[PDB]
């Protein structure tokens, strides 16, 4: 019941559905990379199960190992096939701040923690052979843990949860979002990958940088609508 649509010659997006009560199938997005002699993994399917036959089609299509997988955020659509990546022997990262509520939200860490720089990008020391993974921590948006991916050698940028298609109407549940620097953190998404044409969303179908425009435009309107007031 997963669907794996090709994006770039070594990129594939893969998508698993999972029927959310009141709303029915979500889609949830991640990615697949081929670097040489290896696989590159970012985000996890909702389930162990559905990560799992990821592997399989991986197995099945590419025949190359799983160096390792990046999950963007701590939350079910993300890392919900942790325990299936670690059982495959897949070495995984994460934002350290997202290993330090994967716990608390029920979501099994990553192996390994991500820490960035004061501009963003992702220090080397904690991402060794990343290959065209290129890292970046935008700041506090949808989650205060969300981190995002840009494929170098190709268009593609990868916002997770952060970026919204150009035809949403809000910014989703901003239950763990900061309002007041989601702007910001969107734009940053925007200046950090500035020659990226296709935009890949978590639950969203890829789209253009309208999509990181009109994000931040959303968030813009919320910071003063939460935060502009007496």
Known sequence: SLVFRQLAPNVWQHTSYLDMPGFGAVASNGLIV????????????????????????????????????????????????????????IATY???????????????????????????WVEPATAPNFGPLKVFYPGPGHTSDNITVGIDGTDIAFGGCLIKDSKAKSLG??????????????????????KASMIVMSHSAPDSRAAITHT????????LEHHHHH
Do not use: C
Request: glycine residues 8%.
């Open 34 to 89: 081929r670097d040489g002699g290896r696989v590159l993994v970012v985000d996890t399917a909702w389930t162990d199960d559905q990560t799992a036959q990821i592997l399989n089609w991986i197995k099945q299509e590419i025949n190359l190992p799983v160096a390792l997988a990046v999950v963007t955020h701590a939350h079910q659509d993300k890392m919900g096939g942790m325990d299936a990546l670690h059982a495959a022997g």
């Open 173 to 194: 549940n901003l239950g763990d979002a900061d309002t007041e620097h989601y702007a910001a953190s969107a734009r940053a998404f925007g200046a950090a990958f500035p």
């Open 94 to 120: 994460a934002n350290a701040l997202s290993n330090q509520l994967a716990p608390q939200e029920g979501m099994v860490a990553a192996q390994h923690s991500l820490t960035f720089a004061a501009n963003g």
């Open 216 to 223: 931040a435009r959303m968030a813009d309107k919320l910071r």
